[PDB]
PDB file of C-alpha atoms in Angstrom:
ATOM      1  CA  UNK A   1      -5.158 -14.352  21.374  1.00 43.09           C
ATOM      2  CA  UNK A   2      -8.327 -16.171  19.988  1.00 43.90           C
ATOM      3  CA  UNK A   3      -9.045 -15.411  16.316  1.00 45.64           C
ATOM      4  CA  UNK A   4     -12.652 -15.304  17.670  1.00 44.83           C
ATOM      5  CA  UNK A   5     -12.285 -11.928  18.970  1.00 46.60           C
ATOM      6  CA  UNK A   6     -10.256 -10.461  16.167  1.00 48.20           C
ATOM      7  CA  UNK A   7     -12.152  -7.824  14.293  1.00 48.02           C
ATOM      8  CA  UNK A   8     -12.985  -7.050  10.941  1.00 45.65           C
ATOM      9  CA  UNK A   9     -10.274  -5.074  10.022  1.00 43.79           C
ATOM     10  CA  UNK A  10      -7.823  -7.476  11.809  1.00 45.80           C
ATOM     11  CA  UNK A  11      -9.359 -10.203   9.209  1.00 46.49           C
ATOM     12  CA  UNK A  12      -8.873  -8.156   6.259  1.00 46.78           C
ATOM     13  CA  UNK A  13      -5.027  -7.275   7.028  1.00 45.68           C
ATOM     14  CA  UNK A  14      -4.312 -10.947   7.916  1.00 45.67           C
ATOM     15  CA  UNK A  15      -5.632 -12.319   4.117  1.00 42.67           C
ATOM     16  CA  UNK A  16      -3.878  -8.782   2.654  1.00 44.05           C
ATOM     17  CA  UNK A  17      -0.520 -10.985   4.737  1.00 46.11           C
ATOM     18  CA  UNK A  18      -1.156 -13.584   2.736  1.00 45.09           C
ATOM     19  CA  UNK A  19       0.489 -14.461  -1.087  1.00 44.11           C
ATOM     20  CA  UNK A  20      -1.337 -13.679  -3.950  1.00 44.12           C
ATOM     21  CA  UNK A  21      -4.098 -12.562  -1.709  1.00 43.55           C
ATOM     22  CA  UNK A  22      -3.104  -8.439  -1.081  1.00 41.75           C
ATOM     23  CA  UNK A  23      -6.293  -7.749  -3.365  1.00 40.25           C
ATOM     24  CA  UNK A  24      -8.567  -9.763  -1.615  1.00 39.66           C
ATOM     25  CA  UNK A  25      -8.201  -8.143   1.927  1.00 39.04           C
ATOM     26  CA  UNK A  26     -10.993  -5.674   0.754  1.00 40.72           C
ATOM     27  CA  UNK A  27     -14.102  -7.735  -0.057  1.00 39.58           C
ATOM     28  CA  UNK A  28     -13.769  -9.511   3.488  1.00 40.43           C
ATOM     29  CA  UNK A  29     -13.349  -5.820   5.022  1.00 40.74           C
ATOM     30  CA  UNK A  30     -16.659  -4.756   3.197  1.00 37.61           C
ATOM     31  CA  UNK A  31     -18.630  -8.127   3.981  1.00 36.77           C
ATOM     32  CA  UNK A  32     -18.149  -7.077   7.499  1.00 37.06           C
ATOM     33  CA  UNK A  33     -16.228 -10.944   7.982  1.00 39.20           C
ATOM     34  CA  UNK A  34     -14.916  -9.846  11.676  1.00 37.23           C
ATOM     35  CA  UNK A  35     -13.052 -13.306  13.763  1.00 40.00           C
ATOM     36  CA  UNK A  36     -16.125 -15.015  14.498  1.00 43.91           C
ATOM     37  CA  UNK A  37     -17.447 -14.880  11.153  1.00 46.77           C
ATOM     38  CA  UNK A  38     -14.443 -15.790   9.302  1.00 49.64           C
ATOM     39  CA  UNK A  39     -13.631 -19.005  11.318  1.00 47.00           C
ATOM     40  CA  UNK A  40     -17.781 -19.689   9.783  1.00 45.28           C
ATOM     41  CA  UNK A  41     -16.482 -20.078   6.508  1.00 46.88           C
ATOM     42  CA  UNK A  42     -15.377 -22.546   4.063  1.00 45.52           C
ATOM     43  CA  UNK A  43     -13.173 -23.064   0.730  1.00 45.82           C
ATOM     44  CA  UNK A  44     -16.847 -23.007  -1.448  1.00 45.03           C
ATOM     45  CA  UNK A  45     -17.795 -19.628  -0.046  1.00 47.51           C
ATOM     46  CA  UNK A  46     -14.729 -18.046  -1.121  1.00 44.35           C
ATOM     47  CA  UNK A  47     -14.668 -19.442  -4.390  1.00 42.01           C
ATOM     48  CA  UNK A  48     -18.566 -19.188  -5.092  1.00 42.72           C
ATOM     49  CA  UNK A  49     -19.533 -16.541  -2.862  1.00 43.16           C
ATOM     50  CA  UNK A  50     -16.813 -14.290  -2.815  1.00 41.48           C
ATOM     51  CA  UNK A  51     -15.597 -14.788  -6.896  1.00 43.74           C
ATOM     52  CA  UNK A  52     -11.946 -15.691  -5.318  1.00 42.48           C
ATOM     53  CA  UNK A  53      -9.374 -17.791  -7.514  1.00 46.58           C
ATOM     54  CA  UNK A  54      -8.911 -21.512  -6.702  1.00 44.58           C
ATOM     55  CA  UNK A  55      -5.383 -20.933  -5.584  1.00 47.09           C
ATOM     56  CA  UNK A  56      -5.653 -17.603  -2.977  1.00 46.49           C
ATOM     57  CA  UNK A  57      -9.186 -19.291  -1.850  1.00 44.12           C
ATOM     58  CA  UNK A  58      -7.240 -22.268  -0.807  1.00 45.60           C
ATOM     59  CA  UNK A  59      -4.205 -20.397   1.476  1.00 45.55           C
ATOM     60  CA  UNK A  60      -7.292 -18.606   3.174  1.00 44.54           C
ATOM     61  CA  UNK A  61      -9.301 -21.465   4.122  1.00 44.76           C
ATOM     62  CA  UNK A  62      -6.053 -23.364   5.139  1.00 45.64           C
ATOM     63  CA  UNK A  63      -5.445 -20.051   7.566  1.00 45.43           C
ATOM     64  CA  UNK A  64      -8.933 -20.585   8.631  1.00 45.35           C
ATOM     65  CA  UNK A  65      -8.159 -24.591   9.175  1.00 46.00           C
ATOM     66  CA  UNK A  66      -5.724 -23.583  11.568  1.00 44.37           C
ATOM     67  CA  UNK A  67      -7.027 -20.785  13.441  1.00 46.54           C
ATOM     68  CA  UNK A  68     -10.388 -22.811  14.349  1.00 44.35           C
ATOM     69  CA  UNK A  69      -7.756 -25.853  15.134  1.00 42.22           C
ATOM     70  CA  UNK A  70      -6.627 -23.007  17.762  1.00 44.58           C
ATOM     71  CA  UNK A  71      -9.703 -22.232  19.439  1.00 45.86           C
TER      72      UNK A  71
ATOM     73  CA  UNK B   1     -42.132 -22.481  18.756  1.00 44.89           C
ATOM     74  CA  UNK B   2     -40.644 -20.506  16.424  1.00 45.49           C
ATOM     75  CA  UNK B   3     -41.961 -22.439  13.309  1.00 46.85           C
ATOM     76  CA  UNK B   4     -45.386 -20.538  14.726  1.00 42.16           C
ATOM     77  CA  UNK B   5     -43.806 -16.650  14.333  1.00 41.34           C
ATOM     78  CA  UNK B   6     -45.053 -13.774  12.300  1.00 42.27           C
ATOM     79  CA  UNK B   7     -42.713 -12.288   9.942  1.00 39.06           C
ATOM     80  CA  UNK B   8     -43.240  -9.246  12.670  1.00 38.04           C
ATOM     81  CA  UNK B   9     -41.594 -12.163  15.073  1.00 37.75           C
ATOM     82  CA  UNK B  10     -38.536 -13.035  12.645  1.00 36.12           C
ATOM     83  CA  UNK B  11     -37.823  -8.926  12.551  1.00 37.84           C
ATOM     84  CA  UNK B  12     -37.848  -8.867  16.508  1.00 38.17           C
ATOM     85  CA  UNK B  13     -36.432 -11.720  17.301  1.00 38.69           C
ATOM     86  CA  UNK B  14     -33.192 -10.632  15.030  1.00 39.51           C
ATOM     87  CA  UNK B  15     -33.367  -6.698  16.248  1.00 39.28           C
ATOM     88  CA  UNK B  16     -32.998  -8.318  19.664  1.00 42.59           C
ATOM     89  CA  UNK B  17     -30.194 -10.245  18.651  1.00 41.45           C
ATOM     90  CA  UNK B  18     -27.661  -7.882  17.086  1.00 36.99           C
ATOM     91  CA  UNK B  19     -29.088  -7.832  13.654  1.00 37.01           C
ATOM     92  CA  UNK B  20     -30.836  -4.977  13.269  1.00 36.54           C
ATOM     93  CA  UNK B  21     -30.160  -3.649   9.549  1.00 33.38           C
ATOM     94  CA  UNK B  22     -30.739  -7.199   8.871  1.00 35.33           C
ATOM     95  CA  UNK B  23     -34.168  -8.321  10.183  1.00 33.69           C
ATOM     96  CA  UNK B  24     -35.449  -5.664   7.399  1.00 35.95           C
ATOM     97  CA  UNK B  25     -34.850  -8.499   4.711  1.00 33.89           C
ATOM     98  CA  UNK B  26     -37.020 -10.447   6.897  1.00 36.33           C
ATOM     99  CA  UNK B  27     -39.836  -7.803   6.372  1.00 39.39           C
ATOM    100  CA  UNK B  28     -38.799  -7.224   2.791  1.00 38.93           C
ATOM    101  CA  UNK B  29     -39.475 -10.792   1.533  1.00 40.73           C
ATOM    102  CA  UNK B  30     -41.939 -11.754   4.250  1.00 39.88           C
ATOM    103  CA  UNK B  31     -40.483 -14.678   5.505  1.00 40.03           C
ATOM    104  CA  UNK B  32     -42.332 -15.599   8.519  1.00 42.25           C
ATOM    105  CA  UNK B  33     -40.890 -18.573  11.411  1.00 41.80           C
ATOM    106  CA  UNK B  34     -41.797 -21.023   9.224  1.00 44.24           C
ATOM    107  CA  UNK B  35     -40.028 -20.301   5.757  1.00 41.61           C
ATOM    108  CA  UNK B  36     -37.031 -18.753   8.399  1.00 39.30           C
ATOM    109  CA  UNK B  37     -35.899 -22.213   9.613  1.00 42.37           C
ATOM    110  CA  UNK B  38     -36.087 -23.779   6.206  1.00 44.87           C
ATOM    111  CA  UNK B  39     -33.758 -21.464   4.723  1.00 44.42           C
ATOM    112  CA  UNK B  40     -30.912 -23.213   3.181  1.00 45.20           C
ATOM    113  CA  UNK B  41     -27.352 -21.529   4.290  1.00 45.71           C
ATOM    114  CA  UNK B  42     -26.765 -20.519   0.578  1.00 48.40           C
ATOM    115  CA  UNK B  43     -30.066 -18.822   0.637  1.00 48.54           C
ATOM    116  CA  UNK B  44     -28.943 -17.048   3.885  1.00 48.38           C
ATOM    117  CA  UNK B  45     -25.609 -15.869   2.239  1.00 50.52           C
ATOM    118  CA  UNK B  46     -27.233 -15.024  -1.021  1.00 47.53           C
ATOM    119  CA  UNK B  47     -30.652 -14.190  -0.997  1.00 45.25           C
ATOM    120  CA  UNK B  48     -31.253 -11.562   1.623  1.00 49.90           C
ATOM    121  CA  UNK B  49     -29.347  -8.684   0.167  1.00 50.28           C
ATOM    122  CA  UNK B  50     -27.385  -8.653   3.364  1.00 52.68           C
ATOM    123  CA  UNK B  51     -23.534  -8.670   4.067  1.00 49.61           C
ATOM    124  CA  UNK B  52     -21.768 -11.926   4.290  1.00 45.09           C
ATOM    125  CA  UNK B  53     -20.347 -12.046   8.281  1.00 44.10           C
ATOM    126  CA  UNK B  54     -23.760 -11.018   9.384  1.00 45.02           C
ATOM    127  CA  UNK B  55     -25.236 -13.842   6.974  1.00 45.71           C
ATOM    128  CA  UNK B  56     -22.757 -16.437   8.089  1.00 49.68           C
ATOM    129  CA  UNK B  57     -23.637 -15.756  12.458  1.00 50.47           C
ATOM    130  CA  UNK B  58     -27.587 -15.308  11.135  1.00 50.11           C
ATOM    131  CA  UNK B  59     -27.337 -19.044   9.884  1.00 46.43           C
ATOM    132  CA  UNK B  60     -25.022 -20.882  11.793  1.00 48.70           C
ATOM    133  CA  UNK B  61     -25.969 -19.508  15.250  1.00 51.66           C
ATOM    134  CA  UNK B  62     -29.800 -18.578  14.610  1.00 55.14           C
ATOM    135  CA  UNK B  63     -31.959 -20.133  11.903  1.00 51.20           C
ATOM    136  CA  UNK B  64     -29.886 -23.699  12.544  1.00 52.92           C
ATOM    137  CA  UNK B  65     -30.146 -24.078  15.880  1.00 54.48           C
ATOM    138  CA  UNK B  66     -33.944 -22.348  16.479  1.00 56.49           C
TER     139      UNK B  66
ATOM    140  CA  UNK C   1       3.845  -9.029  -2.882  1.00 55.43           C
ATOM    141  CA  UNK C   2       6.527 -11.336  -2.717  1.00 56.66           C
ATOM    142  CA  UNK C   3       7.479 -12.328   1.239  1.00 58.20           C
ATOM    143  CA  UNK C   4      11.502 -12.145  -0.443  1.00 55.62           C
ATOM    144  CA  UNK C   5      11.588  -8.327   0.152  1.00 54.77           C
ATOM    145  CA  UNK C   6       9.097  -8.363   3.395  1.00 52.89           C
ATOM    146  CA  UNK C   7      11.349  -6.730   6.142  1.00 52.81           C
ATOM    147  CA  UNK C   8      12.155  -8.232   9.516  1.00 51.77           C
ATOM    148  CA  UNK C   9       9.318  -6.661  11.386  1.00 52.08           C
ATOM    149  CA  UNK C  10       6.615  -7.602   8.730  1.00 51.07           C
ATOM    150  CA  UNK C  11       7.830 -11.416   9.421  1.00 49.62           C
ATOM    151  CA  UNK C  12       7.847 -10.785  13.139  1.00 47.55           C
ATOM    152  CA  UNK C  13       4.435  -9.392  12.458  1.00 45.86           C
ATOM    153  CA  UNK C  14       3.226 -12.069  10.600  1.00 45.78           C
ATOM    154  CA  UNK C  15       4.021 -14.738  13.558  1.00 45.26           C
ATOM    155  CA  UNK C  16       2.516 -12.708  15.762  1.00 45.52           C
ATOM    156  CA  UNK C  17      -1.193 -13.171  14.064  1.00 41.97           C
ATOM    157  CA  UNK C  18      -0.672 -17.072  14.084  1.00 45.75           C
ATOM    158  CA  UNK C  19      -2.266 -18.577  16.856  1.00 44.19           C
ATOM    159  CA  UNK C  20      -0.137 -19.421  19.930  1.00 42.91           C
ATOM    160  CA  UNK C  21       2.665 -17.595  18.001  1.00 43.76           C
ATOM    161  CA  UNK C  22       2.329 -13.922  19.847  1.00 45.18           C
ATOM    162  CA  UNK C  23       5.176 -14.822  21.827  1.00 42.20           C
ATOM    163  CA  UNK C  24       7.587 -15.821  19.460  1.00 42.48           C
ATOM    164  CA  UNK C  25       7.841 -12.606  16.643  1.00 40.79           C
ATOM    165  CA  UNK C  26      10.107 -10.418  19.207  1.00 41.13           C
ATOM    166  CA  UNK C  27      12.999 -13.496  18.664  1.00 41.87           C
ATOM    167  CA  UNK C  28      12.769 -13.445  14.954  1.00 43.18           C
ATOM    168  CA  UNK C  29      12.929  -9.553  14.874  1.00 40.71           C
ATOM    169  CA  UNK C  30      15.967  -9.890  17.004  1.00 40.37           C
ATOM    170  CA  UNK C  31      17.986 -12.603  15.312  1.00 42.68           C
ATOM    171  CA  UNK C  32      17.074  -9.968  11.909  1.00 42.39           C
ATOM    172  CA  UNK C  33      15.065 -12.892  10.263  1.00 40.77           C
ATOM    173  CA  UNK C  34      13.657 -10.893   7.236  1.00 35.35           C
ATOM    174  CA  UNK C  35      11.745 -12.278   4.965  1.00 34.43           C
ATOM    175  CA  UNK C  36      14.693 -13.513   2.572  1.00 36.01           C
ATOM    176  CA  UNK C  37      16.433 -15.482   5.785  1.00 36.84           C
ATOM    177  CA  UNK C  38      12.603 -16.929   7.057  1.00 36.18           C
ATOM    178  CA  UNK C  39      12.984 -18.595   3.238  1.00 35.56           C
ATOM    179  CA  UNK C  40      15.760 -19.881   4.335  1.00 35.40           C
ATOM    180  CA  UNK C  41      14.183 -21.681   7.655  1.00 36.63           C
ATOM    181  CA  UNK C  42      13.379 -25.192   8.510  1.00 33.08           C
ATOM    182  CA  UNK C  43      10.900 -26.282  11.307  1.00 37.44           C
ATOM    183  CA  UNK C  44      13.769 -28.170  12.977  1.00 37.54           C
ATOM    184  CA  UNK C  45      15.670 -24.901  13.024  1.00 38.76           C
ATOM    185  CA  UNK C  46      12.436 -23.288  15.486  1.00 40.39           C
ATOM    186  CA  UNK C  47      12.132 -26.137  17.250  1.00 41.05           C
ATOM    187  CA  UNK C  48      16.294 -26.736  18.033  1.00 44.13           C
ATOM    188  CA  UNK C  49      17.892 -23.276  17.662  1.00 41.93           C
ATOM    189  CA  UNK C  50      15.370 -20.868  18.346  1.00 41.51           C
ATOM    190  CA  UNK C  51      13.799 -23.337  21.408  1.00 39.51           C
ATOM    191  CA  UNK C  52      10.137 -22.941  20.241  1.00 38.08           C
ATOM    192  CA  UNK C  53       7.912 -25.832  20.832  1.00 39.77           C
ATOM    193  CA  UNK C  54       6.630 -27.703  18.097  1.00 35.68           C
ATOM    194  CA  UNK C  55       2.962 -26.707  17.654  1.00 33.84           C
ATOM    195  CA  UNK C  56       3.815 -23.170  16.875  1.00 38.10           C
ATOM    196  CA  UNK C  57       6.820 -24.440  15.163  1.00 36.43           C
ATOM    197  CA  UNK C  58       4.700 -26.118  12.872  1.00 33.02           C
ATOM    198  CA  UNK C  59       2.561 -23.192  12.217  1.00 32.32           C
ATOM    199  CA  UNK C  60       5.601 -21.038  11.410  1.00 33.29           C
ATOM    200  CA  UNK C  61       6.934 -23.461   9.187  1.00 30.78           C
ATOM    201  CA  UNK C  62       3.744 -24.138   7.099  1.00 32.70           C
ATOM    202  CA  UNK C  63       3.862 -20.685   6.584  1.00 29.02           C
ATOM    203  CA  UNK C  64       7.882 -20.838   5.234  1.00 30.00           C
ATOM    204  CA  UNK C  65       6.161 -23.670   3.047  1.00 28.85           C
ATOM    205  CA  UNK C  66       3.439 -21.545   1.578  1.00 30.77           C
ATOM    206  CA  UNK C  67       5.452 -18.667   1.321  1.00 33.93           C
ATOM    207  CA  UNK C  68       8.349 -20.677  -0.558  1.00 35.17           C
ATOM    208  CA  UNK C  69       5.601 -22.237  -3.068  1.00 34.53           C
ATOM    209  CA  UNK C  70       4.331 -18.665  -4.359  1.00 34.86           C
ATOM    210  CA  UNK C  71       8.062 -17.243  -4.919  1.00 35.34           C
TER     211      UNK C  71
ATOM    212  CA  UNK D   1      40.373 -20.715  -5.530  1.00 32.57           C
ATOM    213  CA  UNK D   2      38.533 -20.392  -2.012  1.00 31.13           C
ATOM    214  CA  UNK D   3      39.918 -23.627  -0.583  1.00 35.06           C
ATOM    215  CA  UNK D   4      43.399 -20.907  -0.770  1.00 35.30           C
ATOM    216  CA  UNK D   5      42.009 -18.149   1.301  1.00 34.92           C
ATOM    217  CA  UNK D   6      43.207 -16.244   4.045  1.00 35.62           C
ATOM    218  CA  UNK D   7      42.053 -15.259   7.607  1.00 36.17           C
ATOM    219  CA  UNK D   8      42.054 -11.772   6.509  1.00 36.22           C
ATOM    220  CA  UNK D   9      40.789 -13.040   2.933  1.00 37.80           C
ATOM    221  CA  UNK D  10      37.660 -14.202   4.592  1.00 37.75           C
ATOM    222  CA  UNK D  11      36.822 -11.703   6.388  1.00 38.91           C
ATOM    223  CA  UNK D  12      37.491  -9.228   3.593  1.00 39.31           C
ATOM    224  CA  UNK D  13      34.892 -11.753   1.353  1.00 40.59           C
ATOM    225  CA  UNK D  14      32.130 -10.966   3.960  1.00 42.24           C
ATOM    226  CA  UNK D  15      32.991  -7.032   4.429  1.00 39.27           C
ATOM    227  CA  UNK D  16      32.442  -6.844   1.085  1.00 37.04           C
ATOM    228  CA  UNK D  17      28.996  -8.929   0.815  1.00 38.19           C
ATOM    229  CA  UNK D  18      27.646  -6.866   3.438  1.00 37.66           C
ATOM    230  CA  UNK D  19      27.896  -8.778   6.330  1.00 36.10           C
ATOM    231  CA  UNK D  20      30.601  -6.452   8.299  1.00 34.76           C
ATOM    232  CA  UNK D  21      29.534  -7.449  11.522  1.00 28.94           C
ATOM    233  CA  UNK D  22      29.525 -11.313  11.134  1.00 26.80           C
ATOM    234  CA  UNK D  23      32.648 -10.545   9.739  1.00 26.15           C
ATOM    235  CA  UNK D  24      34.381 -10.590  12.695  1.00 25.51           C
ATOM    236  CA  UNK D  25      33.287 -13.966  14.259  1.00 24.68           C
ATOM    237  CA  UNK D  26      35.703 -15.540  10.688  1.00 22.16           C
ATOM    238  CA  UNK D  27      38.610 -13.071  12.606  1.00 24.44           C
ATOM    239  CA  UNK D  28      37.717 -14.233  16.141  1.00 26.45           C
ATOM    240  CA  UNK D  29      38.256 -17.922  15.410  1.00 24.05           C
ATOM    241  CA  UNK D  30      41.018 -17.366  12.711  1.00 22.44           C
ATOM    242  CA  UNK D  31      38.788 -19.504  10.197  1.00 24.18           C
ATOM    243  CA  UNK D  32      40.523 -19.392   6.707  1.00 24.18           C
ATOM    244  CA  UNK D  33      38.973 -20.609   3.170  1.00 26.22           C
ATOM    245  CA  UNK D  34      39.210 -24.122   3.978  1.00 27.52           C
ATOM    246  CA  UNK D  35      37.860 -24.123   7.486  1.00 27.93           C
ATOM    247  CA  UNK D  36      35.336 -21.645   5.875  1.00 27.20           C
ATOM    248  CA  UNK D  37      34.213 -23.922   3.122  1.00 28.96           C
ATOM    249  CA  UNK D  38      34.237 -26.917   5.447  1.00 29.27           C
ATOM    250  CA  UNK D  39      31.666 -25.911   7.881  1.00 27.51           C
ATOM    251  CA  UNK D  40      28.392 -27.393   8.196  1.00 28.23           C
ATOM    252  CA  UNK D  41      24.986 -25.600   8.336  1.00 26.16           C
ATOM    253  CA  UNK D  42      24.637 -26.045  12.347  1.00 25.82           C
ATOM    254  CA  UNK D  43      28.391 -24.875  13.043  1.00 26.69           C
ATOM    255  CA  UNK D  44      27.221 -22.001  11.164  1.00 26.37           C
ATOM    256  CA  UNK D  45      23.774 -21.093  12.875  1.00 25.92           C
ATOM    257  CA  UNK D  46      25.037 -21.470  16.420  1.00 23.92           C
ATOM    258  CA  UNK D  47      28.700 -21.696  16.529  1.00 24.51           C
ATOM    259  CA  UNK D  48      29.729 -17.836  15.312  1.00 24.14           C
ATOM    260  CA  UNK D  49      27.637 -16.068  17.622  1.00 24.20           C
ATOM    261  CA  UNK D  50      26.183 -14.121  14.948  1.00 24.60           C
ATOM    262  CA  UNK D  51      22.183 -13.491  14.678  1.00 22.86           C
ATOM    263  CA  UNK D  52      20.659 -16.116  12.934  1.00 22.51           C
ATOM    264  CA  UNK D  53      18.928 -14.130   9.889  1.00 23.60           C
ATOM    265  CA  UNK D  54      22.910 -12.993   8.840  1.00 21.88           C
ATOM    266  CA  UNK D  55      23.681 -16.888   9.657  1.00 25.22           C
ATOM    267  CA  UNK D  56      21.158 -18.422   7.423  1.00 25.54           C
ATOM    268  CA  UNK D  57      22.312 -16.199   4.632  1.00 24.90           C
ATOM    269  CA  UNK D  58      26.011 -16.456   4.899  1.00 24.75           C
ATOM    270  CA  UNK D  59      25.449 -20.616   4.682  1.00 22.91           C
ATOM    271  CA  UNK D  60      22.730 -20.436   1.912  1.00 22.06           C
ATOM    272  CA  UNK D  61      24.144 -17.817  -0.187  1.00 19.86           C
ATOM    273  CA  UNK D  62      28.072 -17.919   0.059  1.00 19.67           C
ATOM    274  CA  UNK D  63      29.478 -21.102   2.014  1.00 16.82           C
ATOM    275  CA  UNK D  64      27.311 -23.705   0.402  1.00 18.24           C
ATOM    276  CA  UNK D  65      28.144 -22.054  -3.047  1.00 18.02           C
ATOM    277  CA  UNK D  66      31.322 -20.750  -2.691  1.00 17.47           C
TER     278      UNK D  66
END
């Protein structure tokens, strides 16, 4: 089940999954960061874009690493 | 070619594509065909005053491949 | 939110959103792998006991990896 | 010491650790202390028939340190 079609909220609750990263499910939820987006993104956005830590910004681009390795 | 559109061109062409609440920071800041496809991605993610999905699909599958 | 007191459904949940892993959460919720036993869980134990082919048993188990790390 | 245990003294060990119904599998195959003690990780995952979450546990937290 592609990460492609996974929605916004579907996004949100996977990062929320995630350690260190249950406050961070939000922000992604509000940018409107639905499957297709979120496999658009790298480690710089979250850090520089989003204002996200070093350390969660890394286990949520490695999660995106392997989802687009997926598709 | 769309380095020849109207800032009226940039709105329509991203109404017909899905972006509706979008194409108004086309109108807002002018930005006509031209300055469109020059726009650098961080200038797409941060200096239309739009959300960051939308900004992300608006640059990766519009303004770089136009 | 530490994955040490996540329940056995919340880990079978968490497969579940890794791609190519849908299959494999209704296994771990039935061998009661919460999320102080999936600590406890190396890739050769998917791959050998649980008969889960390596791709997703790699996924699964970089997951264990990151999970261990922020305990 | 452990090594000394019991049948019954195992099983009473896990009863009281909260593993009641892995408890039985000790009982089943009459393992004492010393079998207990002696068993290797594998022999423990898929040689009780017990669930494997239990399993992991009861090799982690009591064999390997008992």
């Amino acid at each position: 089940g592609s990460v492609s079609k996974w929605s916004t909220d579907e996004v949100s609750e996977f990062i929320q999954s995630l350690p260190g990263c249950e406050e961070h499910g939000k922000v992604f939820k509000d940018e409107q960061i639905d499957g297709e987006a979120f496999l658009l993104m790298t480690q710089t956005d979250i850090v520089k874009i989003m204002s996200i830590k070093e350390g969660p910004a890394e286990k949520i681009f490695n999660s995106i690493l392997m989802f687009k390795a997926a598709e | 070619s769309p380095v020849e559109w109207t800032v009226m061109d940039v709105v329509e062409y991203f109404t017909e594509a899905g972006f509706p609440e979008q194409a108004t920071a086309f109108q807002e800041q002018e930005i006509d065909g031209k300055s469109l496809l020059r726009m650098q991605r961080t200038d797409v993610l941060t200096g239309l005053s739009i959300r960051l999905g939308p900004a992300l699909k608006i640059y990766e599958h519009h303004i770089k491949v136009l």
